[PDB]
């Protein structure tokens, strides 16, 4: 029953212990505006302040700064819960609060419906499924790269038996206003291709010019043109550029426009362009099980398309690779020392046999309460093995 | 920008609104709907203890005195109280596990004089433990403290 209760009892790394702090991420669609996003961050701050004012101390929201994306389109919300004390029942604890909220922001026009806890141990929450990377190992492009990503995300979305929640990472692919200078039609007009660009760039992108001292501190001087004159396509024309001859020339005179497509977040993995795919194991299956499949589904993909694993799936882990080898030794050296002061080869068996007795309680208790098989349980298991041998030893010893 | 024919002049002011603005207006934040700014600090690989935060509230320490009217530091998000309350609520665990033992000790060999031996032996060893510890680099951690009691 010990082995049974042991294979039954599931495993993890470390417990999400409520840290009187946590944060919710906000993410709007493509081409969304700072205003639009801000409507979202507002609907978010309202909740914590109204329908949860009892637990939430303060919200710190930032519009235009995600864990990626960046710019008017993403938002973050650092929450600071009230004192630990003033938050009794599990009801007022982080897991609950974040839960309620996740379900809360669910009813909103934009997928931000999130909030969560601090992955047990900062930066070290690399145990939440897997990380998949698709590489463009041939001359292919963003066209075929992603075009084989939708095709992979399908094959995996189809059978949620060994794979759950397979998606990409904010690649989107929003439109782009493509302006095309008609070089000659301009070179001919008496206008340098240079004055043209710096004018198009200085006006719509900004230009870091010189520096200046502002109250005994050096700061920058920027040139960019008022907002009203760069909010809409047509506005492109309003801009005039000097000509050799001496007279201005509108942009519309030497350039055409047209909406095209691009990606606000081109990415790469080891030099080659790439696309990151995240996802969860599967309800009752370990990373490995979920992965062998992911490697197969890719094989189908077009030629050139390839893959690799990054952080949170670059290694193989504890119970299932580590412990089953070191655990060997621990009780492998046990049959040693237990001879260094016994000398029988057979007598050190007694003490050894105890081990299971304690492991049964530990597994028992473990299963009864929510508790899982993790580092601490592990830690505990060993010490439990020790104490066992302890008692046993003396009994056996005095006997001898 | 240019001296005009009719004797007049065209100044920058005449072709552009000029004001002190941000270098970029992409990020803007609020602390409870109230406009605000802040410091999004991090760590340096294998950085130091809270010592980092210990010494973040070092620089800010003396900055507060020359602040103009209206500037009040506020602290949303903070890993500190954890460490503070993570410890406390362990050293207590360790103390209690002592009084606890002193009892079981008594309930078996009625003798405030004997029961006092294991009472003098446990602390001793723990002490000696942070010692051998430091000797190998390991620091008093919200993770090293467990194995202490365990």
């Amino acid at each position: 029953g010990m082995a049974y209760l042991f294979v039954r009892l599931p495993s993890s790394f470390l417990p999400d212990e409520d840290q009187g702090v946590f944060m919710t991420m906000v993410q709007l669609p493509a081409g969304a505006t700072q205003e639009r996003t801000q409507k979202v961050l507002n609907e978010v701050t309202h909740y914590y302040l109204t329908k949860e004012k009892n637990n939430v101390e303060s919200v710190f929201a930032v519009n235009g700064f995600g864990f990626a994306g960046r710019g008017q389109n993403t938002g973050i919300a650092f929450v600071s819960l009230k004192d630990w004390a003033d938050r009794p029942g599990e009801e007022n604890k982080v897991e609950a609060i974040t839960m309620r909220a996740t379900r809360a922001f669910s009813q909103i026009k934009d997928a931000m419906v999130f909030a969560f806890n601090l992955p047990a141990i900062v930066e070290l929450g690399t145990a939440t499924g897997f990380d998949f990377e698709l590489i463009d190992q041939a001359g292919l492009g963003h066209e075929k790269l992603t075009q084989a990503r939708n095709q992979l995300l399908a094959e995996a979305a189809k059978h949620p038996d060994m794979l759950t929640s397979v998606r990409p990472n904010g690649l989107e692919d929003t439109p782009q206003f493509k302006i095309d200078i008609d070089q000659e039609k301009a070179q001919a007009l008496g206008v340098s291709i240079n004055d043209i660009n710096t004018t198009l760039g200085a006006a719509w992108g900004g230009s870091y010019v010189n520096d200046f001292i502002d109250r005994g501190r050096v700061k920058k001087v920027y040139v960019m043109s008022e907002a009203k004159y760069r909010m809409l396509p047509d506005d492109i024309g309003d801009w005039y550029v000097r000509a050799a001859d001496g007279q201005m020339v509108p942009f519309s005179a030497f350039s055409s426009s047209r909406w095209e497509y691009g990606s606000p977040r081109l990415e790469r993995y080891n030099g080659l362009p790439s696309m990151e795919i995240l996802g969860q194991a599967a309800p009752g299956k370990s990373t490995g099980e979920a992965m062998e499949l992911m490697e197969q589904l890719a094989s189908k993909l077009p030629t050139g398309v390839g893959y690799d694993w990054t952080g949170m799936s670059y290694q193989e882990r504890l119970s299932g690779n580590q412990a089953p080898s070191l655990y060997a030794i621990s009780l492998i050296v046990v049959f040693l020392c237990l001879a260094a002061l016994y000398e029988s080869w057979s007598i050190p068996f007694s003490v050894m046999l105890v081990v299971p007795l304690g492991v049964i309680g530990a597994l028992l208790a473990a299963t009864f309460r929510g508790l899982t098989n993790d580092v601490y349980f592990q830690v505990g298991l060993l010490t439990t093995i020790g104490l066992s041998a302890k008692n046993a030893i003396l009994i056996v010893e005095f006997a001898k | 920008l240019k001296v005009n024919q009719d004797g007049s002049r065209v100044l920058l002011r005449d072709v552009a609104k000029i004001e002190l603005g941000g270098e970029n207006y992409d990020i803007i934040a609020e602390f409870n709907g109230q406009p605000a700014s802040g410091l999004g600090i991090k760590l340096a690989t294998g950085a130091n203890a809270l010592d980092t935060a210990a010494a973040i509230r070092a620089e800010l320490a003396k900055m507060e005195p020359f602040f103009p009217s209206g500037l009040k530091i506020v602290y949303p998000y903070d890993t500190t109280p954890f460490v503070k309350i993570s410890i406390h609520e362990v050293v207590k665990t360790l103390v209690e596990a002592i009084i606890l033992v002193f009892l079981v000790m008594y309930l078996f060999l009625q003798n405030f004089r004997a029961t006092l031996i294991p009472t003098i032996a446990v602390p001793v060893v723990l002490l000696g433990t942070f010692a051998v510890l430091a000797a190998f680099g390991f620091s008093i951690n919200t993770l090293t403290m467990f194995g202490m009691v365990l």
Binding site: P15, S346, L371, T384, L387, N391, A392, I395, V396 | -
Partner: peptide, 30 residues
């Protein structure tokens, strides 16, 4: 909780058991 629980659980069933079996899988292991 994690720490302690398994620790206790295991410790009880390790005391009220090893106190009967040890005297046995020792004699037997002769």
């Amino acid at each position: 909780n994690a720490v302690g629980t398994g620790v206790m659980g295991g410790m009880v069933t390790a005391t009220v058991l090893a106190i009967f079996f040890v005297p046995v899988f020792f004699v037997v292991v002769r």
